[PDB]
Every structure is written in structure tokens, then in C-alpha cells.
Amino acid sequence: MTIDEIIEAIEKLTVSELAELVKKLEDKFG
Amino acid sequence: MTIDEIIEAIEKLTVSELAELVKKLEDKFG
Amino acid sequence: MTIDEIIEAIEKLTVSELAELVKKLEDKF
Amino acid sequence: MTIDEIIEAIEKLTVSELAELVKKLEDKFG
Amino acid sequence: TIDEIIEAIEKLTVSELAELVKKLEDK
Amino acid sequence: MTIDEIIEAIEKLTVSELAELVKKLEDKF
Amino acid sequence: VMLTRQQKELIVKEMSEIFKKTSLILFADFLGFTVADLTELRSRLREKYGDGARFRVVKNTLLNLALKNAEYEGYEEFLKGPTAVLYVTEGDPVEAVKIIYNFYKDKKADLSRLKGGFLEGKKFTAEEVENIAKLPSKEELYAMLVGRVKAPITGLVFALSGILRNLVYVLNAIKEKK
């Protein structure tokens, strides 16, 4: 997917899904 | 895209594409 | 392997590769 | 360059060149 | 000497600086 | 100066010489 | 009085259909609480969800058949004893968990009385209730996302510059000893 496609999928996430995304990103990087 | 799909997409971006993504998120949510 | 060439090489890495490079730098230094 | 080649290129820069490197990266990505 | 120190340090390669720091940390 | 000569130099510096040294390096980078 | 087989079936069907569209089903022990408390919790929920959320004490047998027919699994451990059910049919479900979590706290009730449930089709345990309850707002989340996404780049600069800082740190150390 493209940058735009990524951003679009991101803004469609629920609060719970978004929190899961942030935490997984947190574990994967830094 | 699903959460894992969103992350997988980001991992595939080049570093230059990542900075662009970040910029497109910084403006919209920053 | 100029400063600018190093930056160019980094910009061309995938995000997955960048994360690994960071881990290697941390381990070594 | 691959990841390992990038590291090798960095290892060979002088200390003063390493500081410049970091400088240029902050400008570009900040 | 000290400015001469910094100059000698700035001329080292990253690998050299790493070894320097390494042996200083072995204090 | 090799690395070992740099070490010997640093090890002989006084507490105040080290202070200046650290301040100057911080400025350099 | 006994309920007709038909009356019971309708209640089960209704409930089963509701659970088929909910985004949250949280099971709570509401024993000992007063009607005043029930009224207050419902008011706090409505203020945020309107009619999109409900909190009702429901007999275990009814809950079991409704969940069974809605095709849920691993919920039996949540129906031990009189159990009330908090569910969301409209709106993001996270805020309802926070509301009931803080309500039990305000009333000084054992938080383990918040047994767990299902969130967006995912089972969560009692201990996980606190996690959900403490999630930051969606806005705060979006804000954090940027730095989490930038981490690799941020980490690279930090790692390279860290090579220079090590020299500075060890020199200070040597000065420290004296």
C-alpha cells in the first residue's frame, strides 16, 4: 500500500485498534 | 488494511518514503 | 562512502532494514 | 550499500566526519 | 596540548575512537 | 598521537583540564 | 409465574441478536449496589452514549443461551453468579469501559468485580479491564502515532550521535573519580 493508503487505513481504526497499532509500533521500533 | 497489514506496509517503505509518511501524519495530527 | 553517499544509502533502505541497522549500531557502539 | 556496508563506511569516517553526518541527518529528517 | 588532544581525537576513525573509549571505560 | 598516547595524555590531565576538555568537545560536536 | 416457552424464546432471540451487533460486552458483579447507583451509572453512560450503551442485570441462564446462539466461546467463566452486562451497540466502546471502571472506583468497590468480556470480538480478562480503562483519547493516540512511526529515523540519529556522547561520558567519569 501507498503512503496515502496507509494513512487512510489508519484513520479508519477504532480507538482500541489504534491503541494496538501504537503499542505494536512501540515494540517494533525504538 | 488490518493493523498487522498497516505495519507490514510501513516496514516495506523506503526510509525516504517513511519520512514522507511521518510528515503527512505530523500535519494532520501533529 | 562519502557522507552524502552514506545518507543516500540510508534513504534507500527499507524501514525494516533501517531498524536493523540501528540495532547493529547500538550493539557495536 | 547494504546495511553492513553502510556500517563499514561509517566506521571509516573520521570523528569530525561523524559529527557532520549526524548534522546532515538532523537537517534532512529532523 | 589539549587542543592538540582534541585534534588527535578528531582525526581518529570511528573505529579508533571506539577502541579509545573502550579502553578508557576499562579505566 | 595514537590512541594509547591520547589515553596517557588524558590520564595526566588535572580535574580542571578535563573540565575544559569536555566543554571543548561538546562544542566541537 | 412461569414464562411460556415462546416468551422465553423471544427473550433469548432478542438478546442473541443484540450480542450479534455489539462492539463491547462486559460482565460485572453488581451485587450490593443500590438503585440510586444503577441510576447514576446509567446516567453517566447515557451522557456519553445516549441509547448506544446499556447496563442491565441479567440472569445467567439467559446470558448463556444468548451468547451460545450468537456463537461466542469461552464466556462461561464470566457467568458465575448474578451478573450484570454492559454492552455497546453504537459509538466507540472504550469510553464505556472507562465509565464503569471509574464508577466502581468512586464507590470503592473491588475492581475484580469487573470480570472481563469481549471487545470488538476479542475476549479480555478482568485484569485487562484496567488496560482498556486507562487508554488515552483517540486524539492523544493519533498524536503518539507520529513519534512511534518516526522511531527508526529517530533511533538512527540517536545511535550515531551516541558514539560521540560515550567519549564525553567516560571523560566526565574520569573527572568524577577525582
Side-chain angles (χ1 to χ4, degrees):
Chain A
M1 292 282 269
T2 172
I3 298 173
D4 309 63
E5 287 177 303
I6 298 176
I7 298 169
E8 294 181 0
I10 284 171
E11 47 190 62
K12 293 180 179 304
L13 296 182
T14 66
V15 170
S16 174
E17 289 170 352
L18 190 174
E20 188 188 302
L21 175 64
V22 173
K23 300 188 186 302
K24 284 187 173 172
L25 247 26
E26 218 162 288
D27 290 345
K28 299 200 71 116
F29 308 132
Chain B
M1 299 177 93
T2 310
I3 284 162
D4 289 353
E5 283 168 52
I6 289 175
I7 293 183
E8 195 55 288
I10 292 169
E11 298 182 302
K12 282 179 162 63
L13 296 178
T14 57
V15 172
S16 294
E17 279 168 347
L18 175 68
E20 266 286 343
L21 184 177
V22 172
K23 198 285 180 56
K24 288 181 179 298
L25 293 186
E26 285 190 1
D27 299 321
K28 191 178 187 60
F29 304 121
Chain C
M1 347 358 292
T2 253
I3 282 161
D4 291 357
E5 299 178 328
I6 294 172
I7 293 177
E8 196 181 317
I10 290 173
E11 312 177 83
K12 293 169 179 176
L13 292 180
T14 61
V15 174
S16 280
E17 286 167 349
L18 175 55
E20 189 45 65
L21 165 64
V22 173
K23 213 301 184 163
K24 285 177 170 282
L25 288 175
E26 293 178 351
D27 282 355
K28 174 158 288 190
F29 312 99
Chain D
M1 308 173 76
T2 58
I3 290 171
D4 286 0
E5 294 175 312
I6 288 173
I7 294 175
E8 277 167 270
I10 297 170
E11 298 175 312
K12 307 223 284 65
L13 294 173
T14 56
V15 171
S16 56
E17 292 176 326
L18 208 216
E20 248 291 356
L21 206 206
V22 175
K23 191 283 188 175
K24 268 185 163 293
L25 286 168
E26 296 172 306
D27 284 311
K28 179 175 294 305
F29 299 116
Chain E
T1 296
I2 124 155
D3 265 4
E4 291 173 53
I5 284 180
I6 299 185
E7 297 190 5
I9 286 177
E10 289 260 345
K11 295 184 193 302
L12 300 175
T13 59
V14 170
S15 287
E16 278 164 346
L17 177 62
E19 175 190 293
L20 169 61
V21 177
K22 197 178 303 302
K23 297 193 294 190
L24 282 181
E25 282 176 353
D26 280 353
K27 51 181 62 292
Chain F
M1 307 185 76
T2 68
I3 95 102
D4 276 357
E5 289 176 349
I6 294 175
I7 292 180
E8 194 163 302
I10 295 171
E11 292 184 353
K12 271 62 175 184
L13 296 179
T14 64
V15 173
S16 62
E17 303 192 85
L18 284 169
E20 177 182 305
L21 211 201
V22 170
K23 197 268 182 169
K24 287 189 172 182
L25 286 167
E26 285 182 332
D27 282 300
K28 232 60 178 66
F29 33 87
Chain G
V1 126
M2 228 63 89
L3 284 178
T4 70
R5 201 195 75 268
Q6 179 159 148
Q7 289 173 316
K8 305 191 294 288
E9 286 177 349
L10 203 168
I11 296 175
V12 172
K13 176 94 158 303
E14 292 186 308
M15 186 88 99
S16 292
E17 295 175 303
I18 287 173
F19 293 162
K20 284 191 62 188
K21 79 157 190 168
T22 49
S23 68
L24 165 70
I25 296 175
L26 180 157
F27 303 95
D29 172 344
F30 201 61
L31 296 170
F33 284 92
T34 60
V35 178
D37 299 336
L38 178 59
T39 295
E40 178 61 301
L41 174 56
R42 282 176 174 167
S43 299
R44 293 189 194 181
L45 288 170
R46 180 183 293 295
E47 163 185 291
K48 297 293 184 173
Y49 287 86
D51 295 305
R54 291 298 171 65
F55 186 67
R56 300 193 296 173
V57 172
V58 183
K59 51 170 298 70
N60 295 302
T61 299
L62 199 185
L63 284 184
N64 209 304
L65 293 187
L67 288 161
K68 189 176 194 305
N69 282 293
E71 303 193 8
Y72 282 75
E73 302 205 71
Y75 57 80
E76 300 79 357
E77 50 165 343
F78 296 139
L79 308 178
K80 293 299 186 294
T83 309
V85 68
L86 182 177
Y87 60 78
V88 174
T89 49
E90 194 184 11
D92 186 277
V94 173
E95 176 67 12
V97 182
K98 183 196 310 298
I99 292 173
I100 194 175
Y101 181 78
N102 291 157
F103 180 80
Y104 269 56
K105 271 177 58 182
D106 297 355
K107 266 52 198 177
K108 298 302 302 300
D110 180 2
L111 296 177
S112 65
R113 292 162 109 306
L114 299 185
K115 302 189 283 190
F118 300 86
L119 205 173
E120 300 187 357
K122 299 169 59 178
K123 179 180 184 178
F124 65 86
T125 60
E127 303 76 358
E128 305 180 75
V129 178
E130 182 186 2
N131 297 175
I132 305 169
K134 200 66 175 190
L135 295 176
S137 69
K138 193 164 192 171
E139 282 307 302
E140 300 179 308
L141 286 171
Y142 278 137
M144 312 173 140
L145 189 62
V146 70
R148 270 56 177 190
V149 170
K150 190 179 186 182
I153 293 169
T154 300
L156 168 64
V157 169
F158 195 74
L160 293 180
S161 59
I163 299 177
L164 296 168
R165 293 191 296 230
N166 288 165
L167 201 209
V168 171
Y169 294 154
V170 74
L171 290 179
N172 277 174
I174 295 173
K175 179 164 71 69
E176 235 76 358
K177 280 192 176 181
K178 302 128 75 170

